[PDB]
Design a protein around this ligand. Structure first.
Ligand code: HEM
Ligand SMILES: COc1ccc(Cc2nccc3cc(OC)c(OC)cc23)cc1OC
Length: 392
């Protein structure tokens, strides 16, 4: 009768079935972790937005009291740049990157994103009448965009796409570490190069702050480049793959987007909301935080089940249904407040161009395998498809 967290989805595009009873307990419920530790489970949309702006919640997975949802994550110590930091140190870091992630900067990259998407679909269409869309499209689009974002030179695009793929797919754990060391090593060299080279992108922008205000040291700069890739790659890739699967499993919603390409921006917001692939943001209370007449005591864990929060029926009528006309505004698929996704302006435009161009170019797109033989991620990680066999 106590509900374990995290759990696997049964259906790639719905929250795990066991959480259903807890949806009625707003704004706070509770779940049990692998070791019997109980944590708060924020089911209320308004409560979730208020808590995610609260400086008394911490992302510091270095603390002995930080809830590690799995036994496997028990090995989490170094603090990860931006997300693994509290303010003021977190804001100091974010302030240096924010100017690279304006909506104007997002908008300026449309033609570069269009060219990446067009090149990958041209290659996929030329290669044959079927594809594994995760490897052929969903995985390389976001890593190639992050190339353009960071200012990786064209000649290095292949190496970068490959090493970023090993990072996610790494046949062996040794491939994941070699890829990581290879990219950190590579970012090191590219910073020296960009000292004695021109360059547009986040890396040149941070070489500029460095000179102009001593600001990012070279090790910090490498950490920023690494987290940007890691935060930007699988999230975007999994939205492309699971959005596609989901669209193919809802023929009448897919037909409305084919009919009216103008709906695609609204559709991307509704898919972010409905899919909520960044499921289960984790905090610990540093101090007592009240919510109504309930108190989250110092040292107690707080889990934000993105997928349920984005299906709060006091905000979204018929929340478990895909609807292109119902405002998906104020969704928390990119989080909210202190740690709200830095790359969300860019992510939205990648999704709009990737899905918009796929639909335009491949009107016959359909699953090339039965939908229940297609593997998807377990409950303890970013949700999404591991493969997506398609034909057209
Ligand atoms: C569909 C794509 C994406 C989704 C669904 C997504 C989701 C999220 C979420 C939910 C958070 C908040 C995590 C928490 O509060 O615990 C986050 C943070 C972040 N995301 Fe994204 N994200 C996406 C794309 C990207 C991209 C493209 C970048 C590119 C650089 C990026 C960089 C970041 C960074 C740096 C943070 C930490 C911000 C901070 O600590 O202040 N993300 N993302
Ligand atoms: C800056 O640090 C990061 C930022 C984002 C990510 C990717 C990510 N973003 C938001 C929510 C996430 C939520 C996740 O699990 C529920 C997850 O599993 C690997 C990755 C997530 C990884 C990061 O690396 C530690």
């Amino acid at each position: 009768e106590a509900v374990a967290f995290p759990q696997n989805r049964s259906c790639p595009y719905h929250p795990p079935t066991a959480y259903e009873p807890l949806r009625e307990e707003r704004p706070l419920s509770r779940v049990t972790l692998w070791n019997g530790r109980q944590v708060w489970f924020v089911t209320g949309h308004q409560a979730a937005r208020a808590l995610l702006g609260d400086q008394r919640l911490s992302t510091d997975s270095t603390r002995e009291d930080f809830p590690l949802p799995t036994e496997r994550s028990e090995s989490l110590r170094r603090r990860g740049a931006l997300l693994g930091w509290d303010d003021p140190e977190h804001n100091e870091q974010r302030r240096m990157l924010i100017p690279s992630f304006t909506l104007r900067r997002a908008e300026s990259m449309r033609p570069r994103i269009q060219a990446i998407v067009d090149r990958l679909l041209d290659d996929m269409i030329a290669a044959g009448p079927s594809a594994e869309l995760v490897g052929a499209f969903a995985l390389p689009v976001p890593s190639m965009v992050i190339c353009e974002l960071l200012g990786v030179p064209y000649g290095d695009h292949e190496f970068f796409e490959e090493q970023s793929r090993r990072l996610l797919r790494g046949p062996a754990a040794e491939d994941i570490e070699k890829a990581f060391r290879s990219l950190e090593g590579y970012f090191g060299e590219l910073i020296e190069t960009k000292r004695t080279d021109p360059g547009e992108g986040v890396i040149d922008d941070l070489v500029a702050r460095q000179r102009e205000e001593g600001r990012p040291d070279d090790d910090e700069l490498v950490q920023f480049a690494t987290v940007l890739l890691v935060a930007g790659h699988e999230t975007t890739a999994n939205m492309i793959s699971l959005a596609t699967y989901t669209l193919l499993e809802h023929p009448a919603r897919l037909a409305e987007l084919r009919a009216d390409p103008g709906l695609v921006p609204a559709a991307v917001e509704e898919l972010l909301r409905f899919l909520s692939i960044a499921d289960g943001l984790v905090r610990v209370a540093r101090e007592d935080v009240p919510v109504g007449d309930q108190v989250i005591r110092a040292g107690e864990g707080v889990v934000f089940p993105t997928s349920l929060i984005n299906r709060d029926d006091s905000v979204y009528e018929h929340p478990d249904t895909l609807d292109w006309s119902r405002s998906a505004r104020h969704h928390v698929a990119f989080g909210f407040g202190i740690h709200q996704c830095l790359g969300q302006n860019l992510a939205r435009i990648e999704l709009e161009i990737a899905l918009g161009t796929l639909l335009r170019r491949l009107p016959g797109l359909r699953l090339a395998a039965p939908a229940d033989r297609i593997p998807f991620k377990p409950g303890d990680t970013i949700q999404g498809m591991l493969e997506l066999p398609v034909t057209w």
